[PDB]
From a paper:
Dephosphorylation of both enzymes is exerted by protein phosphatase 1 ([name]), a pleiotropic phosphatase involved in the regulation of cell growth and protein synthesis, other than glycogen metabolism. [name] is directed to its different pathway-specific substrates by scaffold proteins; PPP1R3 are those orienting [name] towards GYSs and PYGs. PPP1R3C (317 amino acids), also named [name] ([name]), is ubiquitously expressed. [name] is composed of 317 amino acids with a structured central region, containing a carbohydrate-binding module 21 (CBM21, residues 133–261), flanked by largely disordered regions.
The [name] N-terminal region contains the [name]-binding signature RVxF (84RVVF87). [name] was then co-crystallized with the [name] peptide 81–107, encompassing the above signature. The region 83–103 could be easily reconstructed in the electron density map (2.05 Å resolution). It organizes on the [name] surface as two β-strands, with an intervening 310 helix, pairing the [name] C-terminal β-strand. In the context of the various intermolecular H-bonds involving the main chain atoms responsible for the β-sheet extension, side chains of the [name] peptide also significantly contribute to the binding. The aliphatic region of Lys83 is in contact with [name] Leu289, while its terminal amino group forms a salt bridge with [name] Asp166 side chain and an H-bond with [name] Glu287 main chain oxygen. [name] Arg84 complements [name] Asp242 side chain, which also receives an H-bond from the main chain nitrogen of [name] Val85. [name] Val85, Phe87, and Leu95 are almost entirely buried in the [name] hydrophobic groove constituted by Ile169, Leu243, Tyr255, Phe257, Arg261, Met283, Leu289, and Phe293, all also becoming barely solvent-exposed. Following an almost flat region on the [name] surface, a second groove accommodates [name] His99, stacking to [name] Tyr78 and hydrogen bonding to Gln294, and [name] Phe101, sandwiched between [name] Arg74, Leu296, and Pro298. GCI titrations confirmed that the main [name] binding determinant to [name] resides in its RVVF region and surrounding residues with a KD = 14 nM for the [name] peptide 81–107.
Residue numbers in the entry:
A (entry chain B): 82 to 103
B (entry chain A): 2 to 19, 29 to 300
């Protein structure tokens, strides 16, 4: 049975940032 | 079969090159309406999934969202509402979303936001855009479609998703399932609250919402809701947040908002939440450069 885990609690990046031209 | 058939690949291709007939858009509304009505009003979804917040007619930002998240069917999508109003291209936005819903009805999902009601989008842009580019009858066809959108989703029995938030009337999920469609969004009650309420770090329990409709709810309300229903997370949208996502109540709730530099009044990023098959969650942040 699955459990919600946020990635930074597993030593991974919580976020990825995509900066785009407007 | 009374209106003939759409060429959906043609329609999608023309939308991505950013010019539909009135009958094409009508067909998008009627066919997607039938699909919405064939699926539950409380969706039961499985991960992997990408979850997106408000768009508000910012069509070029929607295209950026698909570019970085993966165009359907490369990723599964759940949008949390507020596709139209305020932005300059509500029609392109909702047409592309309805096209993907028709083409990938089991891998692409749209929830109802408070702007998917005629009482709201009459005033905040969509009615005017329909009238200027097509006609009022088309806007009413959109209203008929919007009145059949699902209103909440549960991902793998652990993530409860809706546009606005909780309701003091929500005791059982069956209460959501018993909401009959088509319906407009009334100015009080369960449906209203699911589309309009906000979390508030200063409120204890429930408070009156400043919008003039619905409520605010505090952190113990969230904790008791997750506890009662054996859930792990509430995922909602509706409020602009600076980073495109924002946690509430020790990460028991998250707000997603996917329209960057929202309606020219904010300098926010947009975000989407990536949920893998184990329900490990991360965020993809869209930041326009200056
Ligand atoms: Mn909103
Ligand atoms: Mn909203």
């Amino acid at each position: 049975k699955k459990r919600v885990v946020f990635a930074d609690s597993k030593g991974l990046s919580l976020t990825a940032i995509h900066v785009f031209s407007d | 079969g009374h209106m003939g058939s759409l060429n959906l690949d043609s329609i999608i291709g023309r939308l991505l090159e950013v010019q539909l007939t009135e009958n094409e858009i009508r067909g998008l509304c009627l066919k997607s309406r039938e699909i919405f009505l064939s699926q539950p009003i409380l969706l039961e979804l499985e991960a992997p999934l990408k979850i997106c917040g408000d768009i508000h007619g910012q069509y070029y930002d929607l295209l950026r969202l698909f570019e970085y998240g993966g165009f359907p069917p490369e990723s599964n999508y759940l949008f949390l509402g507020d596709y139209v109003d305020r932005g300059k291209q509500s029609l392109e936005t909702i047409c592309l979303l309805l096209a993907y819903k028709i083409k990938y009805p089991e891998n692409f999902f749209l929830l109802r936001g408070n702007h998917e009601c005629a009482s709201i989008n009459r005033i905040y842009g969509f009615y005017d855009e329909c009238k200027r580019r097509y006609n009022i009858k088309l806007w009413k066809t959109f209203t008929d479609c919007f009145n059949c959108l699902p209103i909440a989703a549960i991902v793998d029995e652990k993530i409860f998703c809706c546009h606005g938030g909780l309701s003091p009337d929500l005791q059982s999920m069956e209460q959501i399932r018993r909401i009959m469609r088509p319906t407009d969004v009334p100015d009080q009650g369960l449906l209203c609250d699911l589309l309009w309420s906000d979390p508030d770090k200063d409120v204890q329990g429930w408070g009156e919402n400043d919008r003039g409709v619905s409520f605010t709810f505090g952190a113990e309300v969230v904790a008791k809701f997750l506890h009662k229903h054996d859930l792990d997370l509430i995922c909602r949208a509706h409020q602009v947040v600076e980073d495109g996502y924002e946690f509430f109540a020790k990460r028991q709730l998250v707000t997603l908002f996917s329209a960057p530099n929202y309606c020219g009044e904010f300098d926010n990023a947009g975000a989407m939440m990536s949920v893998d098959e184990t329900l490990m969650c991360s965020f993809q942040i869209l930041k326009p450069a200056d």
